[PDB]
Design a protein around this ligand. Structure first.
Ligand code: NI
Ligand code: NI
Ligand code: NI
Ligand code: NI
Lengths: 81, 80, 79, 80
């Protein structure tokens, strides 16, 4: 079910956005959309909203967080009434 | 003055709700940098609210929003 | 097919965001997501991304642009 | 002075170099990108809405540069 992955990454790191986008189109999760803002000169905050099973999400998190330049990849997950 | 995301799911039919949050956030003295809304279905929205301020005002905004009639879910993510 | 509605609205106007949300859930179009930023003290910029047929989109535009406080609602459409 | 605009792009993310090139064009641009939202339409198509801010010439120009790129399928500018 539905979740948000909050990522903070470098900015100065190159081909990182390209590699993140690559991962998401690849992922078995359905990534509804991602928003990015500029945190400061050196840092970027990106909020990914996705749907899927708990393995596919957990995997997509380890994948992104594993990229070099991704400083931080926390995950919020919600299930139901 | 740190940054955090606030993930909320709520029923948009609880009238008063949406505007009340807008009011709580203006009051807050945390600035909402930007926000992304997803209309999940007839009765459920997901907002991700990227915001910035002192860590007490952020702690508080969650405290306030989470308890509102019509808010089903509200988790805060600190950038630290 | 896919499109984006860029809306600039008041901010000081009340129950406007609540009325916008209401419309979209309502719309026959499928609204994928909407992002808002603060433009200044008095103005808000909201970018709605939606999928649907050209009548449903054209309707959703007129509906939103009609609301009081919506200063401006341009539309981008792609085949 | 310094106006605001949204730039809607559709592009193929498999054209490697493309994404990074746009990041570069925008840094150079001397328009500051306030924020941006990306939707993965399918295997080969992304839609970015890029909210940005700067002098109307630099904006004009960013469209002009981005629109022409190998891999960009669509690029329309909306002035505020
Ligand atoms: Ni506000
Ligand atoms: Ni909604
Ligand atoms: Ni940048
Ligand atoms: Ni994409």
């Amino acid at each position: 079910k539905i979740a948000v992955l909050v990522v903070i990454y470098d900015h100065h790191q190159r081909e990182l956005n390209q590699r993140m986008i690559d991962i998401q189109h690849a992922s078995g999760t359905h990534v509804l959309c991602t928003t990015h803002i500029h945190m400061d000169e050196h840092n970027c905050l990106e909020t990914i909203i996705l749907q899927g099973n708990s393995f596919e999400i957990q995997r997509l998190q380890l994948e992104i967080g594993g990229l070099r330049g991704v400083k931080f990849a926390k995950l919020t997950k919600a299930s139901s009434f």
